């Protein structure tokens, strides 16, 4: 006879308490006789770098001078990545409206391991 | 079809007003049922020498039954429209 409390896996009868969980992402499946099969590949792997000889530390010196905040946009990214290559190739006759893929553009995301839309990677 | 009239008169609305109706205005009186009115013939022109109705180019009045169910489906006859009527006069005049 309570409506206002949050509904949880603690709360039902036996069957109910089995079915619901907390938020944890499942990492396998079940087979006959309730045997759990784990898939190694479904388990997230921590991609953790080498920290040896690394100068950056978690806090910053106050002695550092202040600079104006300017966020990143597509326009300026194009200007400081693609634009110099394009204009340099515009000077000669190497540039082409077709096959501009040389500059880093891709027609499709289908083949890629890291597909941008829809996103297929974690963080 | 069924044709009805109201028991109660409806007050006038004027030109640009939709009439105001009441629970009383829903009461109807049966005028006539269309299905009970006597039979009428359908005018046709025959394209073929069909049995006991006539021959090609004849203007014939026949029952709606025979017309819609025998004559028109099989293309034995055509509608006696003004457009095709004149056409059948033309082919006759060619003689």
């Amino acid at each position: 006879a309570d409506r206002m409390s949050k509904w949880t896996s603690k709360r039902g009868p036996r069957s109910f308490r089995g079915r619901k969980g907390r938020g944890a992402k499942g990492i396998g499946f079940l087979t006959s006789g309730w045997r759990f099969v784990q898939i190694k590949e479904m388990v997230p792997e921590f991609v953790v770098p080498d920290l040896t000889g690394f100068k950056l530390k978690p806090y910053v010196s106050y002695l550092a001078p202040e600079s104006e905040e300017t966020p990143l946009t597509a326009a300026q990214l194009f200007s400081e990545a693609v634009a110099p290559a394009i204009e340099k190739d515009f000077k000669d006759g190497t540039f082409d409206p077709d096959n501009l893929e040389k500059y880093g553009f891709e027609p499709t995301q289908e083949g890629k391991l890291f597909q941008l839309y829809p996103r297929n990677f974690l963080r | 079809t069924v044709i009805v009239e109201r028991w109660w008169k409806v007050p006038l609305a004027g030109e640009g007003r939709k009439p105001r109706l009441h629970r009383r205005h829903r009461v109807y009186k049966l005028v006539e049922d269309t299905k009970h009115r006597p039979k009428e013939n359908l005018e046709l022109i025959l394209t073929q020498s069909v049995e006991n109705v006539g021959v090609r180019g004849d203007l014939v009045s026949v029952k709606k039954s025979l017309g819609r169910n025998r004559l028109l489906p099989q293309g034995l006859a055509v509608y006696a429209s003004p457009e095709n009527k004149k056409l059948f006069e033309e082919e006759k005049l060619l003689r």
């Binding site: 597509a74 326009a75 194009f78 693609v82 634009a83 394009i86 204009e87 515009f90 540039f95 409206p97 501009l100 500059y103 553009f105 | 079809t1 069924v2 044709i3 009805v4 009239e5 109201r6 028991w7 409806v10 006038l12 609305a13 009439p19 109706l21 829903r26 009461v27 109807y28 009186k29 005028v31 269309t34 299905k35 359908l42 709606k64 017309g67 819609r68 489906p73 509608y79 429209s81 457009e83």
Partner: protein, 243 residues
């Protein structure tokens, strides 16, 4: 408080800002028009005025239609405009007797038709009225093409109309691919109904259907910004070169 616009206007008012705004003009005009159907279940008053036998004074009259209910099965056929009449009656045609609920339903018949333009055999549920109108119009095609939306009273009637008008517009060769001259004859028979193609697209369409169609046309995969910036950059470079 008060709403700015009366509530009855909202249906109209909403057509002006969304997806309905960018719908074609001709479709919106066909949606707007409010013309009355022809009488089916009531004998209309002949004249605008009539003398009262009561007092001998000439009085104005109006034609007030009976409200007609159309069950959804009616959309899957061609009823000439006959619907269910739901009303009340007095028991023995005396007002002093008991009042009772009455429903008058039309008689229905399953009948076979051939459409010349569509070159297709159909089997539809119809009334005697419809059969009579077809006879007077001198064929199914003529009946479908002549009769406005209101009088047809059928989604399926409108769909037949849409097809036929599209076929006339396109001068479709698949009417008779093997027999070209017969195709020519069938076209010139129904030449007076012929309208433009892009207008014929939208005939006999409900608003929900319309907005699906419009949404389908306007929806596009968005252009990568790589193309935009590369186009404009070579433009700036073009003007730079011509200096």
């Amino acid at each position: 408080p008060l709403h700015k616009y009366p509530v009855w206007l909202w249906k109209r008012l909403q057509l002006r800002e969304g997806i309905c705004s960018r719908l074609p003009g001709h479709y919106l005009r066909s949606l707007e028009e409010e013309r009355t159907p022809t009488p089916v279940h009531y004998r209309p008053h002949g004249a605008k005025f009539k003398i009262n036998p009561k007092n001998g004074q000439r009085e104005r009259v109006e034609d007030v239609p009976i409200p007609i209910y159309f069950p959804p099965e009616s959309q899957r056929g061609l009823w000439g405009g006959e619907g269910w009449i739901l009303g009340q009656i007095y028991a023995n045609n005396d007002k002093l007797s008991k009042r009772l609920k009455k429903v008058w339903k039309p008689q229905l018949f399953e009948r076979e038709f051939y459409s010349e333009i569509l070159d297709k055999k159909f089997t539809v549920t119809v009334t005697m009225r419809t059969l009579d109108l077809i006879d007077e119009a001198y064929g199914l095609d003529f009946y479908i093409l002549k009769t406005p939306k209101e009088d047809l009273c059928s989604k399926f009637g409108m769909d037949l109309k849409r097809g036929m008008l599209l076929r006339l517009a396109r001068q479709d060769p698949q009417l008779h691919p093997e027999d070209p001259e017969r195709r020519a004859a069938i076209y010139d028979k129904y030449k007076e109904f012929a309208i433009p193609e892009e207008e014929a697209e939208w005939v006999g369409l409900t608003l929900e259907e319309a907005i699906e169609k419009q949404r389908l046309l306007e929806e596009k995969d968005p252009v990568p910004l790589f193309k935009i910036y590369v186009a404009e950059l070579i433009q700036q470079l073009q003007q730079q070169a011509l200096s």
